[PDB]
């Protein structure tokens, strides 16, 4: 288990998300699904010119898995996945994101729902989750587990639990008062409201 610090501005953004009063939390799901879609776009695109990249799974889809007993909502995709390095650079640093622009926007009148415009939508997970686990598998690396309850750090370790094939799985350990998002009709409502046009099957599992 390796423990890393978030880049300062990331930590600041996370704090903002966790601490700002903002009721319209449901947008977290849209942003996660949107990331999934992007990742699926990427493998689809690369696999045009190299079909062997599908050897780890041809089906391109997104699964939504609620679990009331564990109080978790899991979003799984069969997208391109992330290597260890992608994982650490993309989740722990500003990278190609508009972290700064977002935080500045928030001061100039913008609202949190616009987070996706700035390439940092993943962190909206922290509107509803006390902890977030990201399990990922890229064709070019082994399976890794990223994890963070915020507070300025995250961990990365190899994951030898259930091999995934290829893709990314985001496990949301929900806050106590956010169990709303484990309810079939609530989830259905949100997907219809915000993600009806996504170009990949979205399957909502039942319990």
Q: Are residues 83 and 141 in contact, defined by beta-carbon separation less than 8 angstroms?
A: yes
Question: Binding mask 39-68 vs ligand S36 (x if CB under 6 A, - otherwise)?
Answer: x--x--------------------------
Strands (E), the chain: 2-5, 62-67, 72-77, 129-137, 144-148, 153-158, 167-174, 202-204
- ∠ at Cα 96 (81, 11), nearest 5°? 90
> For residues 119 and 165, which CB has a smaller minimum distance to its own copies in the complex?
119
Query: Which stretch in 63-71, 103-111, 131-139, 156-164 sits in contact with its own copies by CB under 8 A?
Result: 103-111
- Looking at 10, 25, 35, 200, which residue binds ligand S36 (CB under 6 A)? 35
In angstroms, what is the minimal distance from the CB of 60 to its own copies? 12
> For residues 66 and 79, which CB has a smaller minimum distance to ligand S36 in the complex?
79
d(C-alpha 105, C-alpha 98), whole Å: 10
| Cα four-point dihedral sign 199, 32, 92, 98 | positive
Residues forming the site for ligand S36 (CB under 6 A):
32, 35-36, 38-39, 42, 77, 79-82, 122, 134, 136, 168, 170
Residues at the binding site for ATP are 35, 77, 96, 122
């Amino acid at each position: 288990v390796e423990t890393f610090a978030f880049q300062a501005e990331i930590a600041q953004l996370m704090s903002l998300i966790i601490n700002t009063f903002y009721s319209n939390k449901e947008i977290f799901l849209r942003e996660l699904i949107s990331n999934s879609s992007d990742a699926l776009d990427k493998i689809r695109y690369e696999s045009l010119t190299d079909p062997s990249k599908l050897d780890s799974g041809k089906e391109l889809h997104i699964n939504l898995i609620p679990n009331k007993q564990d109080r978790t909502l899991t979003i799984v995709d069969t997208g391109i996945g992330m290597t260890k390095a992608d994982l650490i650079n993309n989740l722990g640093t500003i990278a190609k994101s508009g972290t700064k622009a977002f935080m500045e926007a928030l001061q100039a009148g913008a609202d949190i729902s616009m987070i996706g415009q700035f390439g940092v939508g993943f962190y909206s997970a922290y509107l509803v989750a006390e902890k977030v686990t990201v399990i990922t598998k890229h064709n070019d690396d082994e399976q890794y587990a990223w994890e963070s309850s915020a507070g300025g750090s995250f961990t990365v370790r190899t994951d030898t639990g259930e091999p995934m094939g290829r893709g990314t799985k985001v496990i949301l350990h929900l806050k106590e008062d956010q169990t709303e998002y484990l309810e079939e009709r609530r989830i259905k409502e949100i997907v219809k409201k915000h993600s009806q046009f996504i170009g990949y099957p979205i399957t909502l599992f039942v319990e």
